[PDB]
Every structure is written in structure tokens, then in C-alpha cells.
Amino acid sequence: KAKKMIPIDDDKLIMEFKDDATAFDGTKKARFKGKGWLNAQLSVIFFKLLEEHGIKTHFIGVAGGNRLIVEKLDMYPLEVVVRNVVAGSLKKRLPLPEGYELPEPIVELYYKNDELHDPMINYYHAKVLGISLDEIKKIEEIALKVNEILKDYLAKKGIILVDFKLEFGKDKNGDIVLADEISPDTCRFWDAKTKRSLDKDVFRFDKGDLIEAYKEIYERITGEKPEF
Amino acid sequence: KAKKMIPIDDDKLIMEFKDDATAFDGTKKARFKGKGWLNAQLSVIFFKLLEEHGIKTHFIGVAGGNRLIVEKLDMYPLEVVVRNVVAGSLKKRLPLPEGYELPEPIVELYYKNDELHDPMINYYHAKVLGISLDEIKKIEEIALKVNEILKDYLAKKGIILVDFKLEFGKDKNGDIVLADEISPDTCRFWDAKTKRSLDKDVFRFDKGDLIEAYKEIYERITGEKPEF
Ligand SMILES: Nc1ncnc2c1ncn2[C@@H]1O[C@H](COP(=O)(O)OP(=O)(O)O)[C@@H](O)[C@H]1O
Ligand SMILES: Nc1ncnc2c1ncn2[C@@H]1O[C@H](COP(=O)(O)OP(=O)(O)O)[C@@H](O)[C@H]1O
Ligand SMILES: O=c1ccn([C@@H]2O[C@H](COP(=O)(O)OP(=O)(O)O)[C@@H](O)[C@H]2O)c(=O)[nH]1
Ligand SMILES: O=c1ccn([C@@H]2O[C@H](COP(=O)(O)OP(=O)(O)O)[C@@H](O)[C@H]2O)c(=O)[nH]1
């Protein structure tokens, strides 16, 4: 939908970020010149920050442009959502308004399954899917640590980390490794002062120019204007 | 919808079982002569079996007919579903067929909220709702024990306990107490040999005569035909 995965050997693969965007279960589509580049660069920056804080990620290197070199993993069929501020689907699960500051972070597990439209699950469903409690607990422990690091880092830069989605896999040592991407596609980012979205919500709800929003994020994080 | 609650003092209340049935989020409605009586009697039998196995319930006594006398509790806004065999909404959450035997029981938490149509939640949502992890763990521990007792008891009688819903509240000692009802309205019961529903699914999917189905359950459990 927004990324290509190209095998290299029985060891690593290429993650290519595309300019395509989709929302509302693939029903809304557009293309954004340079979105691939931005998401790639921002993933790189985030993976490197996390690695420095002792988070095992799949990031190996950059292969020029929109391509990252990443470790091949046996992927868990999960999307792991961490939420700090009420937004999106959480409003349908808790009678709390958009912008409501949660007393502590919420972690939600979604089963990656297109036929079922990625339904929420709990630890018991996970076990039936072959994911032990020990594994789930390790997964949530990492997500919550990732949350702390990202939110602290973004707060210093005037960005509120509202919520975000992670994915994980297992390496050949049986270690749990952070995978996929971390980008304005997979996080909610709000300007600390104005509360305005600097993320995919801009595309989702026609809140303005997506590229402009993603550029702003890139500039606020790196300190420089995007080269492309 | 199917029950009346009438206060007595600051201590106990009357639970009245009505002949009304509703399904599909209240959209389907009918009335069944004697359904109140059956559900009341079956709740009584189930609460008494559970009490004997050391499960704290709200059951105090019978007030003649369709009325039970029950302890007043500070109710948790939860519906606690335990599942042994795949049926109902679980088919939309896991790609497994109706009748699939789960490797271990699944416990699901639903937030009792009409405005939101009782959405599934996890332990984190529960905490935001004011339910501690300790409380949730105690709740699930009871549900799972209730499951064992009910399924063992029903298995001896040629009935498979497919799934069921429980509700809980807190007593004045801060103890977690099983509440609401246990009946063919709130459980799936399948005949062990034929796999046929002897529960509300008969009304839900026009599988035959609901009263006949509930009578069969009552006769198979008590050993005698229902008096009314
Ligand atoms: N390190 C990795 N090893 C193996 N597969 C991965 C890795 N990182 C991401 N993937 C997978 O590559 C696929 C490409 O992702 P995509 O179809 O764009 O959707 P999404 O990644 O958002 O689920 C996904 O199924 C994702 O789980
Ligand atoms: N021991 C109890 N103390 C206080 N309230 C109770 C007790 N048992 C059940 N209730 C509540 O009484 C109400 C009547 O139930 P009803 O409207 O028929 O729907 P349901 O019980 O299926 O949620 C419910 O909100 C239920 O939680
Ligand atoms: O398939 C998905 C669903 C959600 N998210 C992200 O996870 C967070 C939580 O999203 P939510 O549950 O609110 O769903 P949404 O409203 O985004 O559809 C948001 O930052 C989304 O951008 C994602 O990256 N991929
Ligand atoms: O509001 C509800 C929803 C479910 N159940 C019971 O809980 C079990 C699980 O139901 P499920 O999640 O499959 O929903 P359903 O298919 O019954 O709507 C079944 O025994 C239902 O009878 C209930 O008593 N009240």
C-alpha cells in the first residue's frame, strides 16, 4: 500500500517507501510527491534514536533514496498501538473526547488479518494464534519503552506524541525485534501549542497539505529543510 | 430488556426475570411464555452449584415465581465472556470455524456502554475506567473457575458449554461478587451428541422453539419437567 519489500538473501531485505497513501481500509487513495522520502528518513532517525536507547530494531542501513536495509524477521501478525492522548478509534471505545490526556498509556493489540479487517484482540486470542503470554508481555514492555523515548524526544521539540503503531518479529536467536516503519503515516503527531495534526490525519480528514505537514515534522526534528 | 431490578433496602434488591427476549442490539423482539420462570430457576441452580464450589455470588434467595433476592453491589461496568468453543462474534475475531474447540479458554472483556454498543476492551482501557489490574486479574480468575465448574457439571449431563457471559460487582467488604444472571439467555449450550443449540441462539437464528429448547435444558439438568 505504501511500502515495497525486496529480498536480498536468507538474511536481510530491502524496505522501499512509496509515495502512495491510503486510508479508511484502502478506500481513500492519493499519491504525494516525496512522501516515500520523508517516511524513510524519519524511520531511519527514529530507529537510530531507539537503538541508542537499547531497543533492538530491524534497521541495518540505508540503500539510497527511499530504501532501507533491514533484518529479515519471522513477523508476529500484530499491530501494536500505544496511546497517550485520545484520538481516532479510541473515541469509539471510551466515552472521552479527542485531546483527552490519558492517566497512563494504553496499549492495544490488533490481529493483522485483511479478511477480518485487523480486529482488536487480547492476550487470550494471541495465545490461540500461537503467541505466548511471555512474548506478549515482552512486546508490550518494548512498546511502552519506545513510547517513553519517542514522546520525551518529541516533547523537547514541541511535538506531542498522541499515539502510534508498531510491528515486531522474531530474529534467529528468538529475540523480539521492532520492525516495519515509524513515520507520520504510523503515528499521530500534534503541534504542542496549536494542537494541529502533523501526520496522516491531514490526509485522512482533509486538514491541509500532507507534504507540508510531513516537511514540518522533518524540519522540526532534524533542524534542516528536506533535500529530496 | 429481560429483567427488572426492584430495591428493598440499602442492602438487597429483587431480580425479576421477564418473558421478553431481544437480540441483535435490541432490534429483534419477541415474548416467550414462561421464559422468565426458566431463566430464574436455572440462575438459582447455577448460583447454588457455584456457591458450593466457593464462588461468592449475589444470590440470597427466591421471592416466588420469577423473582430472586440478591445482594446489592457496586457493579463493574463489564460483561465478562468466557469461550471454550468458537461461536458468535469470535468468528469475526479469529479465522476459525463455528464448533472449533479452543486449545484453552478465551476470556473477553466488554465495556457495558449503550452509547458505544458494548465495545471489547483490554486491561489498559479497564484501568482508565477505574478498574485496577489486581481487580481485573481477580475477575478473570473467578470467571475461569466458574467456567471449569459449569462445563464439568454440564458435560456430565450431555451439554457442551460453548461460551457464556458474566457480570460482577463489589460488596461492602470490597470483595468481588458474581452478579446478574446465568441462564440460556447468557450462555451457549450445545447438545453433546447433535451439536444443536439449547439457548438464545434458537431465538437469534430461528433454529426452532425457544421455550422447547429452554425446557430441554431444565429437564436435562434437574431431572424433572418444568412446573411453571
Ligand atoms: N524486518 C522485517 N522482516 C520481515 N517482514 C517485515 C519487516 N518489517 C516489515 N515487514 C512486513 O512487510 C510487509 C509490508 O508492509 P505493508 O504491506 O506496507 O503494510 P504494513 O507494513 O503497514 O503492515 C508487512 O506485512 C510488514 O509486516
Ligand atoms: N447484585 C446486583 N447488584 C446491583 N446491580 C445488579 C446486580 N445484578 C445485576 N445488576 C444490574 O441490574 C441491571 C439489570 O440488567 P438488564 O438491564 O436486564 O441487562 P443485563 O443485566 O443483561 O446487563 C444490569 O445493569 C445489571 O448489571
Ligand atoms: O492500520 C493502521 C491503523 C492505525 N495506525 C496508526 O495507529 C494509531 C492508532 O490508530 P487508530 O486506532 O485511531 O485508527 P485510525 O483512526 O488511525 O484508523 C494511529 O497513529 C494510526 O496512524 C497505523 O499505522 N496503521
Ligand atoms: O450482550 C450480551 C452479549 C453476549 N452474551 C452472551 O455471551 C456469549 C458470547 O456472545 P458473542 O460475543 O458471541 O455475541 P453474540 O453472538 O451472542 O451477539 C454468548 O453466550 C451470549 O449469549 C450476553 O449474554 N449478552
PDB file of C-alpha atoms in Angstrom, chain A residues 2-5 14-20 31-44 61-70 228:
ATOM      1  CA  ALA A   2       2.808   2.446   0.955  1.00  0.00           C
ATOM      2  CA  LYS A   3       5.920   0.171   1.007  1.00  0.00           C
ATOM      3  CA  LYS A   4       7.764  -2.489  -1.061  1.00  0.00           C
ATOM      4  CA  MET A   5       9.799  -5.381   0.444  1.00  0.00           C
ATOM      5  CA  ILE A  14      15.047  -4.004   1.251  1.00  0.00           C
ATOM      6  CA  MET A  15      12.263  -1.802   2.615  1.00  0.00           C
ATOM      7  CA  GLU A  16      11.155   0.710  -0.011  1.00  0.00           C
ATOM      8  CA  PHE A  17       8.900   3.627   0.933  1.00  0.00           C
ATOM      9  CA  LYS A  18       6.444   4.671  -1.783  1.00  0.00           C
ATOM     10  CA  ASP A  19       4.663   7.958  -2.452  1.00  0.00           C
ATOM     11  CA  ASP A  20       1.235   6.260  -2.209  1.00  0.00           C
ATOM     12  CA  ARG A  31      -0.126   9.962  -4.170  1.00  0.00           C
ATOM     13  CA  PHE A  32       2.190  12.516  -2.585  1.00  0.00           C
ATOM     14  CA  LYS A  33       5.433  13.526  -4.287  1.00  0.00           C
ATOM     15  CA  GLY A  34       8.219  12.911  -1.807  1.00  0.00           C
ATOM     16  CA  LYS A  35       6.178  11.126   0.907  1.00  0.00           C
ATOM     17  CA  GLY A  36       8.322   7.999   0.453  1.00  0.00           C
ATOM     18  CA  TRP A  37      11.474  10.039   1.083  1.00  0.00           C
ATOM     19  CA  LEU A  38      10.138  11.682   4.208  1.00  0.00           C
ATOM     20  CA  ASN A  39       8.814   8.485   5.813  1.00  0.00           C
ATOM     21  CA  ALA A  40      12.087   6.661   5.024  1.00  0.00           C
ATOM     22  CA  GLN A  41      14.263   9.377   6.553  1.00  0.00           C
ATOM     23  CA  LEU A  42      12.056   9.722   9.591  1.00  0.00           C
ATOM     24  CA  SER A  43      12.035   5.932  10.141  1.00  0.00           C
ATOM     25  CA  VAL A  44      15.854   5.979   9.986  1.00  0.00           C
ATOM     26  CA  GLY A  61      21.249   0.569   6.836  1.00  0.00           C
ATOM     27  CA  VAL A  62      20.146   2.868   4.019  1.00  0.00           C
ATOM     28  CA  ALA A  63      20.207   1.792   0.355  1.00  0.00           C
ATOM     29  CA  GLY A  64      19.880   5.302  -1.122  1.00  0.00           C
ATOM     30  CA  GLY A  65      16.670   7.297  -1.534  1.00  0.00           C
ATOM     31  CA  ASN A  66      13.527   5.604  -0.248  1.00  0.00           C
ATOM     32  CA  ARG A  67      15.144   2.248   0.588  1.00  0.00           C
ATOM     33  CA  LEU A  68      16.291   0.918   3.942  1.00  0.00           C
ATOM     34  CA  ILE A  69      18.237  -2.284   4.518  1.00  0.00           C
ATOM     35  CA  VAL A  70      16.542  -4.296   7.231  1.00  0.00           C
ATOM     36  CA  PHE A 228      14.608  15.074  -1.556  1.00  0.00           C
TER      37      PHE A 228
END
